[model samples]
Target: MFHILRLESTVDLSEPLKDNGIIVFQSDKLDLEPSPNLGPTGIDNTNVNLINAKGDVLLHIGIRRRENAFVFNSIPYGESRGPEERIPLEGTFGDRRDPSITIFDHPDRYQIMIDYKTVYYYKKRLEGRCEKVSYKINEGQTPPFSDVLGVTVLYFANVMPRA
Candidate 1:
């Protein structure tokens, strides 16, 4: 499997990504906070996404500001990009910057693993290169979860699973 880890930067892929792989996100700190929209819940702002060639979101990993939690989901090319639709994983993802988030992409579903242990899974929505990767930090306003506050390292794999 192909692998690369980037520090606070987006990557443009040159290969047609395989169907199964993984993504790892490492931050300098947790910087947890809350969202204004509750129950009518979601990604609530800060997150990262893998974009495909046609501009659809292959998948995204979100850090819910208010819930102090983690979630993984995907968006189709023309779907809504609002903040209150996605759902969080099944367990706590921790409260530290040095923590690790591993997402395993399977043929039938997506599994969320915190520090290598499985925590949650959802049906596979889009089997797609992840032509590019991007990150967002709370609508580019506040300094709480400011993009300038800390650096996040991202490790991504878009190839066949290793034996």
Candidate 2:
């Protein structure tokens, strides 16, 4: 059966960098098992979208299924610290899974998406300010796929600042 998967990441807003600053975050590849009952035709299409609170689109990403399984990564963007810090920010996959329901007959041909999201923080020693970052998967992306036969899972880990 065709299943849809949604993924998301959120971070805290701190002070904007006085100068240029950079940070890197890693997204784990999804784990999926092939179902023989599912598509010999295979997954044909996918769509990914990233959005911010103001309803502005930050990033739009998509992919076509060439194989039985798919995996990828997302890069983090630098944010300016200010009053904006309190606002909750988010990223989501609008239609990351195959929408076709015909595939359900062949459960073996498709499985679920499993992965991890990890964020790394770093700053210059002279920049004494500490930052707090929090993350979560938004509900908008969850409802469409919640009842699907396939599974969608996520893991998280963080690194504390060093003195």
Candidate 3:
């Protein structure tokens, strides 16, 4: 099963904080003690940035904090030219759909741990153009993994490393 730890709607970044800001993914399973007023900002995030390796900025993986959930958003890219698609991760006690979730953001990888033994995991699919994700139970299980020292070794050992 899972252990549910009730946390504040948003994290607090206390001492040595900078105006440059801070980001905490739901992973890390650590504690954060913040100064006062460091809770959720009252407004949506306007300048969420997703950049490619080439330094060419990509589309919005914009983020916003509504009452309970933190909504992830994006518009259609390139030729699609369609409506925006929004993915909301409800991480608040008030939201049933996404009650008290934890998100660990790693490079192009992300993992969301919800209640009990469920986990929502995502990894890039080779090219930067696409990704894959799934929700499943993985409690008390060794996260399947292998180690590699270099890129070539990494690909050699795991063509789809996150798989």
Candidate 4:
């Protein structure tokens, strides 16, 4: 659930987009996931999460590939769903253009973000939008993956101080 893919550009706060495949929540619970062959319906179970330094599960993300969208869940690490008073979220999230997320009353101030793109992956061009300001990237633009991620990260950190 959840994914951050792209390259290009550089964010002030994004010193290094270093990821060690470390699980972020679930009482430090680690889930060993196997990579699937890249393809439509490759079908690999992956969970993306963001937790607080106090070892608290701030957010849990999963994907509903069928809808080509992401789903957010509100639950602490190690505990099951029903118990936690899950928050009000999990909708059609395109996740692009200087995206910002919040939890634990963090109150995400500068929600600088980009509209979703249709898609031009593997090897292609003719980029466009999906939603209002996107191409068939389902309605979005299929700019290089790295460009999207890098610029967003760049803008995010750039705008953070002012926000």
Best by lDDT: 1
Choose the strongest candidate by TM-score. 1
| Full-model lDDT, candidate 1 | 0.55
Clashes of each: 5, 13, 5, 34
lDDT of 3: 0.28
User: TM-scores, in order shown?
Assistant: 0.62, 0.22, 0.26, 0.31
Off by over 4 Å in 2: 1-43, 66-160
Tens digit per residue, CA lDDT, model 1, 1-163? 3334343556665565456656554444544445444433244656667778887776677765555556666788788743433455434545444555666666787676665677667665665555666665444232123343222223353233563
Better of 2 and 4 by lDDT: 4
Cα lDDT for residue 136, model 3? 17
Steric clash pairs (candidate 1):
29-97, 33-65, 33-66, 34-66, 35-66
- Say which prediction, candidate 2 or candidate 3, comes out ahead on lDDT: 3
**Candidate 1 ranges beyond 4 A from true positions:** 1-9, 34-44, 68-71, 81-91, 141-163
- Candidate lDDT values, in order: 0.55, 0.25, 0.28, 0.26
- Per-residue lDDT value at 31 in model 2: 17
